[PDB]
Design an enzyme around this catalytic site. Structure first.
Site, PDB file in Angstrom:
ATOM      1  N   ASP B  25    -109.361 -20.157   3.325  1.00 51.01           N
ATOM      2  CA  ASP B  25    -110.593 -20.406   2.582  1.00 51.01           C
ATOM      3  C   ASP B  25    -111.774 -20.298   3.538  1.00 51.01           C
ATOM      4  OD1 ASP B  25    -112.599 -21.131   0.903  1.00 51.01           O
ATOM      5  OD2 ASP B  25    -111.814 -23.123   0.423  1.00 51.01           O
ATOM      6  N   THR B  26    -112.478 -19.165   3.482  1.00 49.49           N
ATOM      7  CA  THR B  26    -113.672 -18.991   4.298  1.00 49.49           C
ATOM      8  C   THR B  26    -114.830 -19.849   3.808  1.00 49.49           C
ATOM      9  OG1 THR B  26    -114.285 -17.066   2.966  1.00 49.49           O
ATOM     10  CG2 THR B  26    -113.047 -16.667   4.997  1.00 49.49           C
ATOM     11  N   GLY B  27    -114.755 -20.355   2.582  1.00 51.98           N
ATOM     12  CA  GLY B  27    -115.773 -21.232   2.049  1.00 51.98           C
ATOM     13  C   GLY B  27    -115.613 -22.685   2.418  1.00 51.98           C
TER      14      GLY B  27
HETATM   15  C1  LIG Z   1    -109.223 -25.737  -5.549  1.00 53.68           C
HETATM   16  C2  LIG Z   1    -109.509 -24.633  -4.536  1.00 53.68           C
HETATM   17  C3  LIG Z   1    -110.928 -24.603  -3.938  1.00 53.68           C
HETATM   18  C4  LIG Z   1    -111.480 -25.995  -3.615  1.00 53.68           C
HETATM   19  C5  LIG Z   1    -111.893 -23.852  -4.864  1.00 53.68           C
HETATM   20  N1  LIG Z   1    -113.265 -23.818  -4.336  1.00 53.68           N
HETATM   21  C6  LIG Z   1    -113.536 -22.863  -3.259  1.00 53.68           C
HETATM   22  C7  LIG Z   1    -113.752 -23.532  -1.891  1.00 53.68           C
HETATM   23  O1  LIG Z   1    -113.893 -22.511  -0.905  1.00 53.68           O
HETATM   24  C8  LIG Z   1    -114.991 -24.433  -1.776  1.00 53.68           C
HETATM   25  C9  LIG Z   1    -116.325 -23.663  -1.719  1.00 53.68           C
HETATM   26  C10 LIG Z   1    -117.519 -24.575  -1.626  1.00 53.68           C
HETATM   27  C11 LIG Z   1    -118.341 -24.562  -0.498  1.00 53.68           C
HETATM   28  C12 LIG Z   1    -119.422 -25.418  -0.455  1.00 53.68           C
HETATM   29  F1  LIG Z   1    -120.221 -25.407   0.636  1.00 53.68           F
HETATM   30  C13 LIG Z   1    -119.732 -26.290  -1.488  1.00 53.68           C
HETATM   31  C14 LIG Z   1    -118.892 -26.268  -2.584  1.00 53.68           C
HETATM   32  F2  LIG Z   1    -119.138 -27.091  -3.621  1.00 53.68           F
HETATM   33  C15 LIG Z   1    -117.800 -25.438  -2.677  1.00 53.68           C
HETATM   34  N2  LIG Z   1    -114.882 -25.253  -0.581  1.00 53.68           N
HETATM   35  C16 LIG Z   1    -114.653 -26.587  -0.569  1.00 53.68           C
HETATM   36  O2  LIG Z   1    -114.624 -27.334  -1.521  1.00 53.68           O
HETATM   37  O3  LIG Z   1    -114.461 -26.952   0.728  1.00 53.68           O
HETATM   38  C17 LIG Z   1    -114.503 -28.342   1.088  1.00 53.68           C
HETATM   39  C18 LIG Z   1    -113.745 -28.464   2.399  1.00 53.68           C
HETATM   40  O4  LIG Z   1    -114.651 -27.949   3.371  1.00 53.68           O
HETATM   41  C19 LIG Z   1    -115.963 -28.416   3.033  1.00 53.68           C
HETATM   42  O5  LIG Z   1    -116.920 -27.414   3.191  1.00 53.68           O
HETATM   43  C20 LIG Z   1    -117.335 -26.935   1.897  1.00 53.68           C
HETATM   44  C21 LIG Z   1    -117.142 -28.115   0.950  1.00 53.68           C
HETATM   45  C22 LIG Z   1    -115.906 -28.820   1.530  1.00 53.68           C
HETATM   46  S1  LIG Z   1    -114.503 -24.240  -5.377  1.00 53.68           S
HETATM   47  O6  LIG Z   1    -115.753 -23.852  -4.775  1.00 53.68           O
HETATM   48  O7  LIG Z   1    -114.221 -25.604  -5.750  1.00 53.68           O
HETATM   49  C23 LIG Z   1    -114.276 -23.227  -6.826  1.00 53.68           C
HETATM   50  C24 LIG Z   1    -114.452 -21.854  -6.720  1.00 53.68           C
HETATM   51  C25 LIG Z   1    -114.273 -21.069  -7.844  1.00 53.68           C
HETATM   52  C26 LIG Z   1    -113.914 -21.641  -9.061  1.00 53.68           C
HETATM   53  C27 LIG Z   1    -113.728 -20.763 -10.278  1.00 53.68           C
HETATM   54  C28 LIG Z   1    -115.078 -20.262 -10.760  1.00 53.68           C
HETATM   55  O8  LIG Z   1    -112.938 -19.606 -10.017  1.00 53.68           O
HETATM   56  C29 LIG Z   1    -113.743 -23.021  -9.146  1.00 53.68           C
HETATM   57  C30 LIG Z   1    -113.918 -23.818  -8.031  1.00 53.68           C
END
Ligand SMILES: CC[C@H](C)CN(C[C@@H](O)[C@H](Cc1cc(F)cc(F)c1)NC(=O)O[C@H]1CO[C@H]2OCC[C@H]21)S(=O)(=O)c1ccc([C@@H](C)O)cc1
Lengths: 99, 99
Positions: B25-27
């Site tokens: 997860d690059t995010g």
């Molecule tokens: C269940 C699988 C994962 C959790 C899905 N997610 C992708 C992740 O990459 C997400 C991205 C992210 C980055 C942010 F800066 C702020 C933020 F709110 C979200 N990262 C994340 O929660 O990381 C945690 C740990 O590290 C910290 O840094 C960042 C915040 C903390 S999602 O975004 O919930 C999501 C994406 C698509 C869909 C549908 C549309 O397809 C639904 C949900």
């Protein structure tokens, strides 16, 4: 370009005539953008992540130029804390992970 | 391996003698693993996401073998919906985005 992950993978995107910074997110299936004025009709949808769910507006067949690469797909608009480009668009520009 | 993003880039991990699947997860800035029994001390922590925040246990200097590659860093344990490998460890295995 090859991108290392020591910093947030942020790119500048152009969508609906507006410029934004978005996070290249391999962990996101779909693209979710912060609240913004998108052209056309929409469909309400609910998506889940860490901490729960959010209500989003689903726009289909939206044009989006990520780092100079053009792509058309589904964009979700709602109360996300950051703009995230999901796998639905990453695949269209040929983005890959390498380790 | 070079990974395409037409499917979720889920990879094997070995942590605490246990085998698991995790999402590259690059995010994600940090690594967050689904609830599991890890040895040693931890410190209470709260982390934020798309839907809000969850309370996790922060473990430091934890060894994890991501798809055969060894790395040591901070692992957060809590009610995440999916095991996610974050950038703190992706850099340790040489992960890059390429397009
Ligand atoms: C269940 C699988 C994962 C959790 C899905 N997610 C992708 C992740 O990459 C997400 C991205 C992210 C980055 C942010 F800066 C702020 C933020 F709110 C979200 N990262 C994340 O929660 O990381 C945690 C740990 O590290 C910290 O840094 C960042 C915040 C903390 S999602 O975004 O919930 C999501 C994406 C698509 C869909 C549908 C549309 O397809 C639904 C949900």
């Amino acid at each position: 370009p090859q991108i290392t992950l020591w910093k947030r993978p942020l790119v500048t995107i152009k969508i609906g005539g507006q410029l934004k910074e978005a996070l290249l997110d391999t962990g996101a299936d779909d693209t979710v953008l912060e609240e913004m004025n998108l052209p056309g009709r929409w469909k309400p949808k609910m998506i889940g992540g860490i901490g729960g769910f959010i209500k989003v507006r689903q726009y289909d067949q939206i044009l989006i130029e990520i780092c100079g690469h053009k792509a058309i797909g589904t964009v979700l608009v709602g109360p996300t804390p950051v703009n995230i480009i999901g796998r639905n668009l990453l695949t269209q520009i040929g983005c890959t992970l390498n380790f």
